[PDB]
Amino acid sequence: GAMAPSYRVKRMDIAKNDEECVVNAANPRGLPGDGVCKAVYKKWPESFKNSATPVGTAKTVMCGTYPVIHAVGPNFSNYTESEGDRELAAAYREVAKEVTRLGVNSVAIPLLSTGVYSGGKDRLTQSLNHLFTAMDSTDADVVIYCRDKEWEKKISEAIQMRT
Ligand SMILES: NC(=O)c1ccccc1O
Ligand SMILES: NC(=O)c1ccccc1O
Ligand SMILES: [Cl-]
Numbered sequence: 001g002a003m004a005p006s007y008r009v010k011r012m013d014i015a016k017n018d019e020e021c022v023v024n025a026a027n028p029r030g031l032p033g034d035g036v037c038k039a040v041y042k043k044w045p046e047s048f049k050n051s052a053t054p055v056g057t058a059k060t061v062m063c064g065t066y067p068v069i070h071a072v073g074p075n076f077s078n079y080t081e082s083e084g085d086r087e088l089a090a091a092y093r094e095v096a097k098e099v100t101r102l103g104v105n106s107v108a109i110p111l112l113s114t115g116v117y118s119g120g121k122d123r124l125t126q127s128l129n130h131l132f133t134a135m136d137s138t139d140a141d142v143v144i145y146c147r148d149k150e151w152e153k154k155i156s157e158a159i160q161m162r163t
């Protein structure tokens with residue numbers, strides 16, 4: 001575990017992270033995808049061997065010895081708000097199990113279901129709160145990656161508020 005487990009946020013490409021493993025915002029079929037998923041495919045293409053996994057789950061594939069945790073958030077275009085909320089919470093609980101199993105001291109994580117899978121809604125708070133619910137009981141250093149300057153400030157505020 002980390003000596004003093006923390007949350008941090010950085011506004012940069014998750015493919016350039018400084019952590020011991022990465023969470024991919026994957027699609028269920030293990031396809032190259034868009035946004036985070038396409039950056040992860042360019043950086044760690046070997047980790048897409050048999051990465052397909054259902055919505056609400058996470059499947060880890062090694063790229064060399066570097067673990068890529070493929071986490072499948074729901075597409076809110078297809079799910080009801082209620083069922084989508086349930087699957088989004090479940091994906092993050094499976095990420096926490098994988099981070100724990102791997103015995104890593106740090107993890108790079110995007111906000112699941114906030115891009116193409118958001119169904120055109122702002123889900124920063126919804127996705128971040130499910131991330132905290134899952135990861136608060138883990139002792140890894142968590143580093144959240146985002147692109148938007150206003151999202152960086154809002155994620156930083158939410159982290160700082162809890163202390
Ligand atoms: N400003 C950027 O280029 C950037 C920042 C965060 C994530 C992906 C990116 O391409
Ligand atoms: N490559 C990225 O990390 C990125 C790309 C799109 C949106 C958010 C992100 O953090
Ligand atoms: Cl960058």
Ligand SMILES: [Cl-]
Nearest residue numbers: 114115116117
């Ligand atoms: Cl997304």
Ligand SMILES: [Cl-]
Nearest residue numbers: 146147148151
């Ligand atoms: Cl963002």
